[PDB]
Design a protein around this ligand. Structure first.
Ligand SMILES: [Zn+2]
Lengths: 192, 4, 227
């Protein structure tokens, strides 16, 4: 069964923020789509109106956006899997850097890969919580996503696992994130 | 092979 | 990197047991080695098709087309019409690396460049693209047109395909005339009077890429006389 992708700000009013960092990761709010480079730092901010309690965890899981491949499990192409972080399995697509308490789940039921990190409140004077994600496979990777568009699902959950917040966004791992972002963005306003 |  | 990424031979002598393969080479990712891939498939008890044959594909074997990319050859068109999946050769390689059959849906090759969509299109199950279609083929070339498009249209679910040289039918009973600039003016005038659309082979090919009957007058290249 495909995990749900419906926006759910929840009781804490959870929302997502995107930054930039040659652009290595850029975000289009018109398309709600992230264009980044292979194994590059992708800043994803967490904005909450109500500070969640301790023990709260942030899970990340990628699904395919098209209907004909939505039921297909997202994984890393066997080429990039045969050739390493350490705590991250070689089949996982999404990784987290900067956090030493990160977990990687494979799910004995669905068999989908996910990566979770304990929630932390904004630090010294911050207004959100930045998580640094990494995508270890190109969109055009044969054997993996294979040109299929994928959505990244970010969820908030308590210590047990019950849902508290959900947001999603499209991701394209390409060589030129800026060029492709402008290309699709115009390729969108030109329809009108 | 030959393309068309 | 090359010889290793090509992969080894399958230890499981029956890895590809029950699959038929129709390899095609684009006219000139790791490069496609046709005979090496054939050796990999044969070693895993895979059956190699000499050509397209719907007498084994529709019966015992699960047919698959192996190629390096999307191409405009006869085998590619026949599989696009019959709904046989177009799968990259890496699927063979990555499977021999693991000695375990991989999901070919992760190795689907594109259909081709669409004129209506102006981009390369990913493949989807076709399930016949020429259902209930009476076609009249008019050309001077018998082999690479009167036979080619006859077989491709027929394996695409066409209700009837007639082969007429450009010198010698029921007409009005047809739905479309697929011809080329060698069409006699008699067929063009009779078709015009009957309001019968006359298109070129690009309409058929684009129908195979998109996977559905597209507009006759949708693109200028669909005209037979397009010079
Ligand atoms: Zn990859």
């Amino acid at each position: 069964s495909v995990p749900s992708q419906k926006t759910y700000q929840g009781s804490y009013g959870f929302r997502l923020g995107f930054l930039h960092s040659s652009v290595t990761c850029t975000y289009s709010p018109a398309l709600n789509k992230m264009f980044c480079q292979l194994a590059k730092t992708c800043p994803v901010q967490l904005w909450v109106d109500s500070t969640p309690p301790p023990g709260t965890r942030v899970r990340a899981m990628a699904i395919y956006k098209q209907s004909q491949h939505m039921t297909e499990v997202v994984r890393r192409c066997p080429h990039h899997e045969r050739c390493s972080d350490g705590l991250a399995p070689p089949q996982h697509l999404i990784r987290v850097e900067g956090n030493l308490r990160v977990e990687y789940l494979d799910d004995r039921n669905t068999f989908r890969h996910s990566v979770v990190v304990p929630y932390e409140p904004p630090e010294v004077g911050s207004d959100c919580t930045t998580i640094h994600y990494n995508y270890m496979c190109n969109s055009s990777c044969m054997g993996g996503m294979n040109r299929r568009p994928i959505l990244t699902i970010i969820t908030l959950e308590d210590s047990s696992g019950n849902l508290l917040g959900r947001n999603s966004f499209e991701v394209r791992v390409c060589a030129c994130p800026g060029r492709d972002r402008r290309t699709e963005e115009e390729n969108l306003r030109k329809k009108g | 092979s030959q393309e068309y | 990197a090359l010889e290793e990424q090509r992969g080894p031979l399958p230890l499981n002598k029956t890895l590809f047991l029950g699959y038929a393969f129709l390899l095609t080479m684009a006219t000139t990712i790791p490069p496609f080695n046709k005979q090496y891939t054939e050796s990999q498939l044969r070693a895993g008890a895979g059956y190699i098709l000499e050509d397209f044959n719907e007498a084994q594909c529709n019966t015992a074997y699960q047919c698959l087309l192996i190629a390096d990319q999307h191409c405009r050859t006869r085998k590619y068109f026949l599989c696009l019409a019959s709904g046989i999946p177009c799968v990259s050769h890496v699927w063979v390689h990555d499977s021999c690396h693991a000695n375990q059959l991989q999901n070919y849906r992760n190795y689907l090759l594109p259909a081709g460049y669409s004129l209506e969509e102006q981009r390369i299109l990913d493949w989807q199950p076709r399930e016949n693209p020429f259902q209930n279609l009476k076609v009249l083929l008019v050309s001077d070339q018998q082999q690479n047109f009167l036979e080619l498009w006859s077989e491709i249209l027929m394996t695409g679910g066409a209700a009837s395909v007639k082969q007429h040289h450009s010198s010698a039918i029921a007409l009005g009973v047809f739905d479309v005339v697929v011809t080329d600039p060698s069409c006699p003016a008699s067929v063009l005038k009779c078709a015009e009077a009957l309001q019968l659309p006359v298109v070129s082979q690009e309409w058929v090919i684009q129908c195979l890429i998109v996977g559905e009957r597209i507009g006759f007058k949708q693109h200028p290249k669909y005209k037979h006389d397009y010079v």
